[PDB]
Design a protein around this ligand. Structure first.
Ligand SMILES: CC(=O)N[C@H]1[C@H](O[C@@H]2[C@@H](O)[C@@H](O)O[C@H](CO)[C@@H]2O)O[C@H](CO)[C@@H](O[C@@H]2O[C@@H](C)[C@@H](O)[C@@H](O)[C@@H]2O)[C@@H]1O[C@@H]1O[C@H](CO)[C@H](O)[C@H](O)[C@H]1O
Ligand SMILES: CC(=O)N[C@H]1[C@H](O[C@@H]2[C@@H](O)[C@@H](O)O[C@H](CO)[C@@H]2O)O[C@H](CO)[C@@H](O[C@@H]2O[C@@H](C)[C@@H](O)[C@@H](O)[C@@H]2O)[C@@H]1O[C@@H]1O[C@H](CO)[C@H](O)[C@H](O)[C@H]1O
Ligand SMILES: CC(=O)N[C@@H]1[C@@H](O[C@@H]2O[C@H](CO)[C@H](O)[C@H](O)[C@H]2O)[C@H](O[C@@H]2O[C@@H](C)[C@@H](O)[C@@H](O)[C@@H]2O)[C@@H](CO)O[C@H]1O
Ligand SMILES: CC(=O)N[C@@H]1[C@@H](O[C@@H]2O[C@H](CO)[C@H](O)[C@H](O)[C@H]2O)[C@H](O[C@@H]2O[C@@H](C)[C@@H](O)[C@@H](O)[C@@H]2O)[C@@H](CO)O[C@H]1O
Ligand SMILES: CC(=O)N[C@@H]1[C@@H](O[C@@H]2O[C@H](CO)[C@H](O)[C@H](O)[C@H]2O)[C@H](O[C@@H]2O[C@@H](C)[C@@H](O)[C@@H](O)[C@@H]2O)[C@@H](CO)O[C@H]1O
Ligand SMILES: CC(=O)N[C@@H]1[C@@H](O[C@@H]2O[C@H](CO)[C@H](O)[C@H](O)[C@H]2O)[C@H](O[C@@H]2O[C@@H](C)[C@@H](O)[C@@H](O)[C@@H]2O)[C@@H](CO)O[C@H]1O
Lengths: 126, 126, 126, 126, 126, 126
């Protein structure tokens, strides 16, 4: 299952842009969250994307001009990230697969946590 | 503030062991979570540690025999991680500092989520 | 087009095994070539795969327990390499895409150039 | 022998310029090839240089302000590359050594395959 | 003991500036040395700092806008370097610890060896 | 001149062995030093070699089955290190060049400083 030890969610992007994570399907009416994480790197950025406990849906898009791929764990495969909420990269909690899912209906209700959600660019010195 | 873009929480460890994260101070009666994340690496492991939305306290220890340090964002400083819950590394949500805090009183109430909490070892091919 | 500057053919493998390249579709009645390139590396091996002038077909497989993907140029996508000649990774000279092609009919007549064909494991010190 | 597994031909350059490969000594009247591969990198560029099957001579030069050295396999030594066709770096197919050879007489007959010959700059994300 | 095999003195800096080493406590009235080593790197610079035989005191500071930390051997801890002689980073020959020590009274008597003392920025191609 | 900023002395070795530094030519009858610095790395070790103030001669050898080369500053060239004191790599203080020199006559009078002289293996985490 993605997010389990051994199946960690990583992203690789080129050029500047924002990776946005939508945290939703919260148990007992927990508020859904949307937050954009910017990079200004002109080259490659590597990222770790986390879940939040008590949520069952995680969707993300890349809005930069350059490529963006995900990798699961130490797997070799890198596959394109969604570029709009109508074709988001989405993970159902417990799933081993990233699917394409339209989550346009979820976004308007989410609270904004730009630069404070659970996706992180790795720096030059790690 | 730690966990914000630019102040991401990274760990560096040497040798095998477990990085254990206690997610607590939940809003809305949310159950606290404790989960150990194992590495079998004999060398250096780099890690990304995430918070979970709707929690206000994040405490972690390294249970392995080798060294463990944290780094904030692209900062150069690397400082020892706590090695027992009475001297845990702890972040109060909104703080820019990792403090040493006794959270022994929090641990027994937390639900166990070993290999499924918000701390991730980076692989050899990222 | 693959093999042009900017669209170089790279491979990434995990663990020991052999990458085999089949050079065929020769102009001027050139004979077909097959050559296995082994690695004993336990971890990630990166590779450059070249064409030969005057040939129009390039087919390759990975034979190993571990994963194998190709990457084109500096692009972020990494996609699985074929694991038998009946579903080889194949490039038609001029194409920008790697296809799956059965080339089992080419193999028996190809001249064997094991450890002397146009696929190279990159070393630890480049 | 250079181009065999363990004796792969690598180039290291500094700054922008062009690496040109001359593939010649073709069997069965195969036409000679000359092709320039440019880099605009301001720093170090690493390169893999391939032979083509059915050719017995491979000669290369670097045209740039900055240094250029070759390395054989995972060997440590790095030695200067020729900077003009009258003192080209040259490999006789079967040789374990890079020699200096004047191939000015070979150049005019070669077909031009600029940006489509068997020398490759390695990307930032391999 | 710092400067023994396994306890080598390394520095990590960000941005341009000068690392200055003061070599003092010379046996048999050997002359004290002070020398500034500049970097113009915009990003991270890694450094090796050596002692000189027959000296018993080594003190250093970083003058630059960016961060500077030292690391002992392959240890994970990185700790801030002194930014003035009144709170220099200092090593007593035979000590395993870097201390803060005011050496302002040592500086004026030391002979100037700017760009020729025993502290070295590592290059991009090592 | 080697050891000046921009012309730092770096070594690259493969496999386990010892790099031995002989510090001699001491002003005012300063005692000569010989010290072996071991590596147990199975692959590449990178090294920084320092002079000591008040000495005018620096000679080094590599004892191991694998290769050893030196590199000056950010230069691309890497050239073999001497493998015995009769064919030592030697630097005359102020020279821009490493020469081969027999220093067997200097060795017997040098004091032993094994694992405590001015040559440093770089760690896995720098
Ligand atoms: C039409 C064709 O096959 N072109 C190839 C060319 O054949 C000609 C033939 O058409 C007629 O003109 O007689 C000529 C005698 O002077 C010659 O035989 O011959 C080239 C030499 O074999 C060949 O190029 C070689 O093979 C290619 C696959 C490639 O490796 C080249 O780098 C190599 O020199 C011609 O193939 C075409 O070359 C162009 C080069 O721009 C393209 O790559 C095409 O995709 C190739 O078909
Ligand atoms: C001696 C020679 O020319 N051998 C090359 C071989 O020629 C024979 C020809 O002599 C006669 O026997 O007809 C045969 C057809 O029935 C064949 O044409 O042809 C090989 C190709 O089929 C050729 O190998 C090619 O060219 C090489 C330069 C190299 O690129 C090979 O990978 C490639 O397949 C023979 O050349 C020798 O190949 C051996 C292979 O081990 C060595 O590399 C020698 O150095 C080559 O001269
Ligand atoms: C059936 C159900 O809704 N269970 C709730 C927990 O969610 C499940 O947790 C299990 C734990 O092993 C498993 O992940 C299932 O997939 C979840 O449906 C819930 O656990 C909390 O929320 C989860 C989404 C996950 O984040 C977990 O780590 C977290 O503790 C608990 C909360 O106390 O309540 C259960 O009713
Ligand atoms: C006063 C209060 O309790 N506000 C609640 C939110 O917590 C604060 O959120 C802001 C968000 O900008 C900020 O992080 C403060 O530090 C929080 O105290 C709460 O937000 C949710 O829980 C937070 C701990 C944080 O994880 C946030 O991302 C998450 O959305 C909201 C939503 O449930 O409830 C508010 O009452
Ligand atoms: C003063 C003394 O007792 N010994 C002198 C040496 O200094 C010591 O060297 C030993 C070597 O095992 C050890 O490092 C002690 O900490 C030193 O105090 C001195 O050695 C020279 O200078 C040292 C500072 C050190 O750099 C060493 O490598 C160098 O050879 C010698 C020669 O001057 O004199 C002894 O009397
Ligand atoms: C003999 C002379 O001209 N000067 C002596 C110093 O040696 C020279 O130092 C200069 C500095 O630019 C230069 O390196 C010359 O090539 C040296 O010959 C000598 O300096 C001490 O020993 C040196 C070998 C060097 O290590 C230097 O950094 C160190 O301080 C001093 C002794 O303090 O005496 C001068 O007369």
């Amino acid at each position: 299952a993605i997010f389990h030890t051994g199946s960690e969610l990583f992203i690789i992007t080129r050029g500047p842009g924002k990776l946005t994570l939508l945290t939703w399907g919260g148990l007992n009416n927990l508020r859904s969250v949307i937050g954009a994480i910017p990079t200004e790197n002109t080259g490659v950025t590597k990222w770790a994307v986390s879940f939040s406990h008590n949520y069952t849906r995680f969707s993300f898009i890349w809005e930069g001009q350059g490529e963006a791929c995900y990798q699961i764990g130490n797997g070799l495969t890198r596959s394109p990230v969604g570029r709009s909420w109508s074709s988001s990269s989405t993970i159902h909690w417990g799933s081993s697969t990233v699917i394409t899912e339209d989550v346009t209906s979820v976004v308007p209700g989410a609270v904004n946590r730009d630069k404070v959600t659970t996706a992180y660019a790795l720096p030059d010195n790690l």
